[PDB]
Symmetry: C2
Subunit: 86 residues, 2 copies
């Protein structure tokens, strides 16, 4: 995996590993990752995660290109879909 | 390279790529990385960097197990040797 999303801040709690591709809520759930639940994530250099407020890559978005130990109030427990790219 | 050390904060400036192993100042210099100069580091999941205040792994140490965009006052521009190990 090149991206790992964690339930709690500081890279702890249930985690899901992601590789290049698109992850709507259903796909995140298949990994055990819940909606409006991610709080931190690791980004392997050379990759990035585009976070989306709504499912199916809709709503406001933000790009994470380095490990984030605790998402801010706008993004913490708000992610519903993610796109991972090189 | 599972670990990249940068000259400046926010992963910018001259960078050196490190893999599993031990890096005294001599080895860091062979990569162009200077003494008391590192300010940020990217660390690939599954690996970690043990920083040392002095050369040859001497003095105080600290572990960087996730990207650090700007070392604190105690470690910024103070690293003299590093060891990369599995995490
Ligand atoms: Ca959470
Ligand atoms: Ca990383
Ligand atoms: Ca949401
Ligand atoms: Ca510096
Ligand atoms: Ca030093």
């Amino acid at each position: 995996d090149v991206i790992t999303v964690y339930k709690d801040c500081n890279y702890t709690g249930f985690s899901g590993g992601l590789t290049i591709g698109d992850y709507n809520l259903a796909r995140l759930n298949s990994l055990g990752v819940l909606n409006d639940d991610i709080s931190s994530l690791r980004i392997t250099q050379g990759y990035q995660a585009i976070l989306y407020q709504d499912d199916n890559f809709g709503g406001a978005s933000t790009v994470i290109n380095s490990d984030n130990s605790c998402l801010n109030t706008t993004w913490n427990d708000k992610v519903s879909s993610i796109r991972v790219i090189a």
